[PDB]
Amino acid sequence: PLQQTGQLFGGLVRDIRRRYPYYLSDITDAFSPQVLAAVIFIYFAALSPAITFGGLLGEKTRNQMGVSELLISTAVQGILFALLGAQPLLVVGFSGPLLVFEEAFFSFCETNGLEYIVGRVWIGFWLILLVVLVVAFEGSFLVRFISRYTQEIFSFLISLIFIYETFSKLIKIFQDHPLQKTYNYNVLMVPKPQGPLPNTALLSLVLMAGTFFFAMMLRKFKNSSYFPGKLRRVIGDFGVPISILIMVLVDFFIQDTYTQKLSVPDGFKVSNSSARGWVIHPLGLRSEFPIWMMFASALPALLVFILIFLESQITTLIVSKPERKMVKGSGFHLDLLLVVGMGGVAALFGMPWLSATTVRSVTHANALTVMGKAQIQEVKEQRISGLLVAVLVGLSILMEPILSRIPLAVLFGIFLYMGVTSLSGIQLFDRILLLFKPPKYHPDVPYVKRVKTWRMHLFTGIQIICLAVLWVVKSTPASLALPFVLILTVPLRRVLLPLIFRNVELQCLDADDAKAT
Template sequence: MPNMMEVPIPVRFFFILLGPINSDLDYHEIGRSVSTLMSNTSFHTAAYKAEDRRDLLRAINEFLDDSIVLPPGDWDRKSLLPVDDIKKKYDDIRKRKMSKKKTTLSLEEKLPQYEPLQRSGRLFGGLVSDVKHRLPWYLSDFRDALNGQCLATAIFIYFAALSGAVTFGGLLGDKTSNLIGVSETLVATCATGVLFSLLSGQPLVIIGVTGPVLLFDELLYAFCKENDIEFLAIRVWIGMWIAVLATLVVAFEGSALVRFFTRFTQEIFASLISLLYIYESFYKLYMIFVTHPLLSGNAYCDNSTSDFTGANYSLANYSFSNWTMEDDFILDVPPMRQPNTALLSLILMFSTFFLADFLRKFRNSSFLGRNARRALGDFGIPIAIILVVTVDFFIPNTYSQKLQVPNGLSTSNETRGWIISPVSSTHPFVWWHIFVAAIGALLVFILMFLEIEICELILSKKERKLQKGSGFHLDLLLICYMELGCAFIGAPWMCAATVRSVSHLASLTVMSRTHAPGESPHIIGVKEQRVTNLLVSLLVGLSVFMSPLLREVPVAVLFGVFLYMGITSMIGIQLFERIILFFKPTKHFPSVPYAQKVKATKMHLYTVIQVVCLILLWAVKSSSLALAFPFVLLLMIPLRLQLKYLFTEKELECLDGDDGGLQSDEEDDPDFYQQTILPS
C-alpha cells in the first residue's frame, strides 16, 4: 500500500471502521479517538504486547481511568488550566484508596485464618478465635464512626429500639401483673446494650426484648402463679443456669450446631411467633370490647353507677394506672362499660397498623426523592405511634387504657425493688426449685441460642461484605451472662433483635453511586464500628425520664404495633408464600427455585409437613405443657433430617436452602423483614 502514506514508515496496526452511509455518527471523530489512544505511550506499549481482544480492552480502560474527558464545545486556555489540578487531586484520591486497601490487606494477612463455625477441637477454641480475630480491629471500631452516616444511623436505630422497648415492655407488664414493665425494659436495654457494644464480637447486633423470650416469660409467670412459686426469685436461678449452660456450650464450640437449624425449623418457629403477634393483638382488642361493650344509651345510663365504681373489678392479666375524672376524685381501679372506649381502641389499633404499613410501602413508591422515602419508611413505626397518640390526646372525653410507667428510675410495681433475691421473701424456700429452674433455663436457652446464632448468620453473609468478623461464640457467652444481671434486677431477658440488627446494618451499608444506568448498585462496604450501638443504648436509658410522655401512650397503639410486626414479618417467611400457591394453578407460580425446580405435589407435601408441625407447636403452647414448646421446636431438627427419604437432595436444596444473594435495586429497596426470618 505505497499510496497510503506520505513517507515510507512500517505499519503495525490497521483500524477498520464499518458503518452506514447515512448516520449521525462522526466517523472522523472516532478516528481521532483511536489516534489519541495510539499517541499515549502506555497504551501504545500495551497494544504492542496485546495477544487478544481482552488485552486491548484492558488497556483502553486504563487509559480512560487516567483521562479527563471534556464534552464537545469551545474551550479557552483559562478554562482548561484547572484540569491539571483536578487530575492531580484525582490521582491523590486514588493513591489514598490504594494505600488504605493495602493496609487492610496487610492486616488481614497478619490475622489467622478465620472460620467462625469450624470446630478447632480445643476447649473454648471458638471463643479464643473470636477474640483473636476481633481484637486488632478494636481501635478502628471507634475511628470508623467519625462520620455523618453513623450519627444518622444512631438516631434512626434509637427510635426503632425505643419503640420496641416500649411495646414489649408494655405487653410484658400486662402479662406479669407489672412485675416487669417498661421501666425495667428500658434500664436493661441500656445496660446490656452498653456492655454489648463495648465487648461483643459483632457490635452491629442490636440487643432488646424479642417475641420468643416474651412468650417464655408469659408462660413462666402462668406456671409460677399456678404452682405458688415466686416469679422473680425463680428467674434468678434460671439466670444462673443460663450462664452455666452457655459456658458449657461455648467451651465445646456448640455454636457450630446452628447449621442444623435450617430454614425448615426457622420458618416454623418464625410462623408461630408471627401468628402469636396477630392473635394477641386481636385477643386484647376483644377483651376491651368485653370490658367496654357497645351498648345503647339507656343501657349506659342504667349501669354506669354500679359498674363505674366497682372496686372488686379485675381483668385477667391487665395492669392499669390510676385514672382521674376530676382533680379530687381518683379511682384505684379502671372504669368499666365506658361509652366509645372499645370503638376508640379499635380505631387507634388499626390506625397505627395502617399508618406504619403505608409508610413501609411508601419507601418504594415514586413520590418524593429516594432519601426522603427511605427516611419515612425507616421511621414508619415511631411516626405512626406519635401521630396516633396525638389523635388520642385530643379526644379527652373518651377513656382509653394507657401505659403504666412510674416516674424516673422507680420500679413498675411498688411491691418489688431493684435487687431481686434468689430466696423468696414471701414464699418459703424449697430446694428443688433450683432444679426446676435448670429445666426452665434449658428451655429459654434454646430460644436464645436460636435467635442469637441466626441473627449472627444473617449479618455474616458473604454478600454483605463485612470485614471485621463475627462473634458466634463470644456474643452467645456475653449475652447469656448478661441475662444473669437482668434476672438480679428483675428485668426481661435480652436477646439479639434480628429485624433491628438488619436495619442497623442496612443503614451503615455504603452502596455504589457510579454504576451504569440500568445496572443495580452494589455494596462497597459497611461502616463497622461500636459507637452507634453505644449511642443508641445510652439514649434508650435516658428515655426512662420520659415517663410523663410514655404514660400518654394508649395500649391499643401497642396492639397496632404488634399487629404490624406479625403481618409484615410474614413477608420474609417462605412458608406463607407456599401456602398461597395451594390456591394457584402452576402456570401462575413465581419464578423461584422451590416453585420451578420442584414438582407441585412435592412442594405442597413439604408445605403440609411444615403446617402440621406449626399446628403441633401451637397446640403445645396452648396446653398445660406450654413451657415445653422449645423442646418440641428442637424435635423439628431430627424430623428435618428424615425428610431426605421423601425428597431428593436437589429438591431439599430448593425448598430448604437460602434465597441467594441480596438484591439491592435503586428503585426498590429490600424490606428489612424480607431479609430476615425471625420477626423480632
C-alpha cells in the same frame, strides 16, 4: 463461624477476632437519618413489650419481679450487649416463654414453700456455669444443623403469634368497653376504668387502623417514584415515627374520649419494697433456703438455657442470613455467653434474665436495611442504634409526661405493621402464597422450575402441619416443651424428608443461600 476449631473457647475467641476490628465502623456507620428513625421505632418496639410483660410478671409473681426490674434489666443488658456483642443488631428483652417459665417457677416455689426470688438466684448461678462450659467446648456449633427449614418454621410461628396477640389485645379492648345503647356517665377512672366507656373501643380500632395504614402507605411511598428521591428516602425512613406522631396527635386533639395510655412506674424502685430489696441473698430473705434446691436449681436452669439458646441462636441465624447482605459477621458463641451470663448476674439482683427476641431483632435489622434500585443493597450494621434504644428504655421512667400521651392502639398498629413486615424474607410464607396462585404465575425461583408443583405444595403442607403442631403445643399447659418440639423438626428434615423427597428437591427447597443446587 459455625466451624468447630477443637480448641477451648475457640468459638468465643474467633468471634472476637472477627467482629471487634469493625468497632470503629460500628460507631461511624450510625451517622445517618435511617439509624435515628430506627431508634424511635425500636424504642417503642422494645419498650411496650417490656411494660406489658413487666405488668403481667408483677401480677403473677406478686410484684417480686415487675415493670421497674424488667426495665432496668432490659436497659443494662441491652447497653452491655451493644457495647460488647458480636451481633449488635439483636434486641435483647423479655419474651412470652420466659414469662411462662417465671409463672411455672413461682407456682412451684409457692407450692413447696420456697422463696421464688431466692430460687431464681440459684438458677442464675447454674445458668452461668452451663453457658461457660458450653462456650468452652464450642457447644454453639450445633446451630449449623438448624437449616432454613427449622428457622423459617420458627420465624413464621413467632410472627403469627405476634400478630395474633396484637389483634387479641384489640378484642380485649372491645370486651372491656362493649358497644351499648346506654352507659354509666359516672364511672370511676383510677386506676383503670371500672366500667364500659363510650367510643373507647371504636376509637382504639381507628387509632390502630390509621397507624397501620399510614405506616404501610409511607413504606410504599419510600419505594414509590414520587418527590425528589433523597426527600422520599428520608420521609420513608421516618415512616413509622411519622405515623406514630400523626395518630398520637389525633388522639391528643380528641380529649373527651378515653384511650388507654402507656404507664411507666413512678421511679427506680423495686415493685415490692416489702418483699425484697435490690440485692437478693442466696441463703434466703425471710426463710433459710434449703440445700436440696441449691442443687435442684440445675434442671430449671437447663430448661431456661435451652429456651434462651434456641430463641437467641435461631434469631441470630435469621438476621445473619447471606440473603440479608450482612458483611460484618456475627458471633454465635460471644452473644450466647453475654446473654446467659448477664441473665445469671441479673438473677442475683432479682431481675429477669432475657434473650434475643426474634420479632424485635428482625424489625431492627429491617429498619436498618437499605434497598437498591426490590433488592437489598446493604444493612447499616452498627452499635449505636441498639445502645440508644437500651438507654431510652432505661430512661423511660423519667419521660413519663411524653409516654403518657401515647395510646396503646397506635402501638398496636405499629405491632401489626411489624408482624406483617417480618414475613417478607420467609420462603415458607412465599410457598404458602403459591398454594393460592395458579402454577403459571409461580415466580422464577429454583424450587419452582426444578421441583414439580405438587411436590413443592406437599413440602409446604408438611411444614404447615409442623406449624399447627407447634401452635397446639403453645396453647397447652405444656408450652415449655416448645423448644423440644421445634428441635424435633431437625430429625424430620434430615431423616424422614430424604425418604420421600429426592436430593435435588431438598437442595432446591431447603437451601441456605437460595441457590439452584
